[PDB]
Design a protein around this ligand. Structure first.
Ligand SMILES: [Mg+2]
Ligand SMILES: [Mg+2]
Ligand SMILES: [Mg+2]
Ligand SMILES: [Mg+2]
Ligand SMILES: [Mg+2]
Ligand SMILES: [Mg+2]
Ligand SMILES: [Mg+2]
Ligand SMILES: [Mg+2]
Ligand SMILES: [Mg+2]
Ligand SMILES: [Mg+2]
Ligand SMILES: [Mg+2]
Ligand SMILES: [Mg+2]
Ligand SMILES: [Mg+2]
Ligand SMILES: [Mg+2]
Ligand SMILES: [Mg+2]
Ligand SMILES: [Mg+2]
Ligand SMILES: [Mg+2]
Ligand SMILES: [Mg+2]
Ligand SMILES: [Mg+2]
Ligand SMILES: [Mg+2]
Ligand SMILES: [Mg+2]
Ligand SMILES: [Mg+2]
Ligand SMILES: [Mg+2]
Ligand SMILES: [Mg+2]
Ligand SMILES: [Mg+2]
Ligand SMILES: [Mg+2]
Ligand SMILES: [Mg+2]
Ligand SMILES: [Mg+2]
Ligand SMILES: [Mg+2]
Ligand SMILES: [Mg+2]
Ligand SMILES: [Mg+2]
Ligand SMILES: [Mg+2]
Lengths: 144, 201, 117, 64
RNA sequence: UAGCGGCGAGCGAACGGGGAGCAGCCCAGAGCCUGAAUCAGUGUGUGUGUUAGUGGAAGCGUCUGGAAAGGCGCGCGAUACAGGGUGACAGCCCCGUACACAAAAAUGCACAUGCUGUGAGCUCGAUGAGUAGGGCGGGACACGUGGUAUCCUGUCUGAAUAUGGGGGGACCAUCCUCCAAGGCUAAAUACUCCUGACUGACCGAUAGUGAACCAGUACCGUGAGGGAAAGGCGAAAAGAACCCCGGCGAGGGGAGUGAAAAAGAACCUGAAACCGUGUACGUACAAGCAGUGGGAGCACGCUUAGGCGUGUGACUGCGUACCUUUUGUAUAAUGGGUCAGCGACUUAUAUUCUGUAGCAAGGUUAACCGAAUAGGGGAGCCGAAGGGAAACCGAGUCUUAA
RNA sequence: GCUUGACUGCGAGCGUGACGGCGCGAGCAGGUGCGAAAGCAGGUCAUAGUGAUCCGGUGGUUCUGAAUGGAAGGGCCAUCG
């Protein structure tokens, strides 16, 4: 193991393309840009979504819906996250302390995702009917 | 696993995951390369056609003169013109995952004990900060090119090694991947190896 | 990391100019003209490695035709006679025999005339 | 600098589960009196972006 | 992201979180106590800088060579093997370097102290009006007048005044929160004409500053302004005494110096185009991209009877340059007089995919801290759940009375 | 003659388009007309009679509502320029 004996992994350091360096390179004299036109020019090319003048897709379709400001303060909690909490009893504060939900989360819902093994006391959280059964099946307790 | 000391002739137990794992050359190579990149200063620059001192005046009119059309005396085609893609001061430092860095040290340390390039002693010190003493001590151990790693950095040992070219001392926390590879032998005190294990989990 | 091109550029210009030794005028002196002359010379050489095989066979056939008519038979009937006699001597050898050994060539004509008759 | 989303596209395409995009149908803003109820009914539900147009949408919504 | 936006191109927050840094005060007024905190000015002393400096270790022999610092041998110093120079590459020749010291005088910063000015503390009062707000016209807020809060004001108006007023994004009620129309305030931040030290996977004379050189010069322009070219003898000038040709020239030949003068100042190396002298061969009856295949003869090197190599090339088959652009070019379409040097897919940040490496239902930190590539820092970001415009529900959900 | 199927929600499966789209459609649910009944009817023998998006209007709406209750505005459904 010397400084002049270390070698990178096979196929991890592919060489980059070098355009316009002769015929043998396969990329000479045009750099793979074709012959003429807008796309062959330096800085050439059309912007995103441009379709040649036809009404682009994101303009011929209607806008729909609105953004809910309550969805930004609502999170979902998996069953597998109930064991990461400290103390057993879970609420908004204990989930935030465990870095499970964001600091600005005001509403939290436990869903049937993952699996819970220890008795957990859920307090002040909405629980799906599937997760409610799984929590009670592990000796847990749900209180509003 | 046991690391036999050179003088006390007693074994020293160490974690097998730290000193007895396989050598991941691809992993070590990336960390060694990234360490060299971190040493780069990257202080350089050239002048584009915008920074070259000169006038924006058109050297001659567009048509009629019979010469190739020109627009600026600073053009990169011209002598004394700018550089087409003039360099800027850049930062060559790469990111190394914490686990990839620590994973490379374990692969290097485990490789050293496999090459018998790692020597473990109970203690290593000199009385006065005199390079003559340290040079004599290493000759007794048949060592010329060696990296010495101690638990606490002693000033006398540090001063005595400053002028020795093929020798350098290092704290237990100051080890780096390229130093462990660059030197022929690596001498670690029993205190240093203990501190290295805590560093590498 | 600036790279000056002087050393390697002169090396490859000399490599071309060395292959152009003996060409007339600028074709052996200046690189732009010598390079075209060397490429054209390579094209001709590739083409003529195929033409050489045609020109020599054409020469052998002509010599065989001459020597055969000295014995009273044309090249056409002579070749057809040899195939009917199961002789598989090629034209490079027949033309060689026709020049350096007349009596052996006459013996071949007798063999060819027998297979025809 | 970060890529900027085409905000007009963000108000018209929603990313679905398997990476596709849903969108509202056209032809349902005005002039419905002359349109057959069957035609208008089939335009109410959201539709998926066709395979030929996914390249345009993905380019416009890099963070979707 | 939320938003703004011919809802186009584009523009683009805040709340909140993590860090660096952290400092609070005065007037709109009397009184009591009083000159008490504090700051400034101005001295003094102490400390630490800065402006000259001082000391600073340790090697010889032999070989090659013009020259030793190189080779070989045997020593020595090192808190000094940074660096530079010295007749080739020096730890020990020199200058330095590590380290240890040094100021008559001026001066920075601290401290302490004196002087001068400055006023602390307490009680009781007071609480910024053509102002807030409004109409009209503009502007600023990410926010283009929109349902448009908030801020500024050119114009016209115009309150309440703590039993009061402002804000919480039209607006109202409730609640919460703050007190405008008077000021001051260090640090964390931005920058480098300039000074010193140090560093470079920066340049090395067409590069790097325009300028390595007496360069913003020569030169150009009425002027503003524009703006070059141009580095290298040798270790040391030891820069060629003297002689000869020549015009008491230029230039040259000797001599001499030197390791070298084919290093002679038009001076290291000395390429190519281009121009010559000499030799070998060809060439004055022969038609064209000038080569290529075949090939005699001649010259020469051989070996040697090897019958090979090299140069030339009578004669002969075939054969209309290159690039670009084109359906298509010998084209009489474009471009190139030639040579030498330079001259064009980069960089940064995002994003996606592939490869590869680490870890894996987890992965990873950012700023920042840190004798700092370590370690700390998990603020965050992505992923493990989706459906719906949304409330919401959730391995389902939406659609619908179903 | 009698009538309002020129129905509401859907829709197996196809046709035709680069796409935006356009077209055909048995059957299912709800409710209805004609017929004694089997049945037929989601406009007209078929193929032309048309205009994306934005912006805005009108009606509805067990959606949203920037401290909270409302509202404004927005969304969704129907429809207009
Ligand atoms: Mg093209
Ligand atoms: Mg072109
Ligand atoms: Mg074209
Ligand atoms: Mg967090
Ligand atoms: Mg330049
Ligand atoms: Mg780190
Ligand atoms: Mg053939
Ligand atoms: Mg509508
Ligand atoms: Mg001295
Ligand atoms: Mg000394
Ligand atoms: Mg409000
Ligand atoms: Mg409070
Ligand atoms: Mg220059
Ligand atoms: Mg040069
Ligand atoms: Mg200039
Ligand atoms: Mg210049
Ligand atoms: Mg003279
Ligand atoms: Mg010279
Ligand atoms: Mg003749
Ligand atoms: Mg011909
Ligand atoms: Mg043309
Ligand atoms: Mg073509
Ligand atoms: Mg044409
Ligand atoms: Mg042709
Ligand atoms: Mg031409
Ligand atoms: Mg011509
Ligand atoms: Mg022309
Ligand atoms: Mg021309
Ligand atoms: Mg029915
Ligand atoms: Mg009936
Ligand atoms: Mg009809
Ligand atoms: Mg509200």
């Amino acid at each position: 193991m010397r400084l002049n004996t270390l070698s990178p992994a096979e196929g991890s350091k592919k060489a980059g393309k070098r355009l316009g360096r002769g015929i043998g390179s396969g990329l000479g004299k045009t750099g793979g840009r074709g012959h003429k036109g807008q796309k062959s020019r330096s800085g050439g090319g059309v912007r995103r979504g441009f379709e040649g003048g036809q009404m682009p897709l994101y303009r011929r379709l209607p806008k729909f819906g609105f953004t809910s400001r309550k969805a930004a303060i609502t999170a979902e909690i998996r069953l597998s996250d109930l064991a990461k909490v400290e103390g057993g009893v879970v609420d908004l504060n204990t989930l935030k302390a465990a870095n499970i939900i964001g600091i600005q989360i005001e509403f939290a819902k436990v869903i049937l995702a993952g699996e819970v093994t220890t008795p957990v006391t859920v307090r002040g959280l909405r629980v799906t009917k599937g997760a409610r059964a799984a929590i009670e099946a592990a000796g847990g307790k749900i209180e509003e | 696993m046991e690391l036999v000391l050179k003088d006390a002739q007693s074994a020293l137990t160490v974690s097998e995951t730290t000193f007895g794992r396989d050598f991941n050359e691809a992993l070590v190579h990336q960390v060694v390369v990234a360490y060299a990149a971190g040493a780069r200063q990257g202080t350089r620059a050239q002048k584009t056609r915008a920074e070259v001192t000169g006038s924006g005046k058109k050297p001659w009119r567009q048509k009629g003169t019979g010469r190739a059309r020109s627009g600026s005396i600073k053009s990169p085609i011209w002598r004394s013109g700018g550089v087409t893609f003039a360099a800027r001061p850049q930062d060559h430092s790469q990111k190394v995952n914490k686990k990839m860095y620590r994973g490379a040290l374990k692969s290097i340390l485990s490789e050293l004990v496999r090459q018998d390039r790692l020597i473990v002693v109970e203690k290593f010190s000199v009385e006065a900060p005199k390079t003559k003493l340290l040079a004599q001590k290493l000759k007794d151990m048949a060592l010329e090119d060696v990296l010495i790693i101690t638990g606490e950095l002693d000033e006398n040992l540090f001063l005595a090694a400053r002028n020795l070219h093929k020798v350098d001392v290092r704290d237990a926390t100051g080890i780096d991947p390229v130093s462990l590879i660059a030197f022929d032998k690596v001498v670690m005190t029993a205190d240093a190896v203990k501190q290295v294990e805590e560093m590498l989990a | 990391a600036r790279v000056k091109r002087g050393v390697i550029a002169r090396a490859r210009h000399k490599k071309i100019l060395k292959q152009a030794k003996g060409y007339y005028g600028a074709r052996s002196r200046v690189y732009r003209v010598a390079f075209q002359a060397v490429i054209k010379a390579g094209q001709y050489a590739y083409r003529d490695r195929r033409q050489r095989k045609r020109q020599f066979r054409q020469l052998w056939i002509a010599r065989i035709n001459a020597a055969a008519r000295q014995n009273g038979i044309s090249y056409s009937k002579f070749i057809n006679g040899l195939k009917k006699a199961s002789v598989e001597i090629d034209r490079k050898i027949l033309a060689d025999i026709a020049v350096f050994d007349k009596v052996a060539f006459t013996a071949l004509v007798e063999k060819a005339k027998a297979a025809l008759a | 600098p970060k890529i900027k989303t085409v905000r007009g596209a963000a108000k018209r395409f929603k990313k679905t589960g398997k990476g596709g995009f849903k969108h509202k149908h056209a032809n349902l803003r005005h002039i419905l009196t002359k349109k057959a109820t069957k035609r208008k009914r089939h335009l109410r539900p959201k539709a998926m972006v066709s395979k030929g147009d996914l390249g345009l949408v993905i380019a416009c919504l890099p963070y979707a």
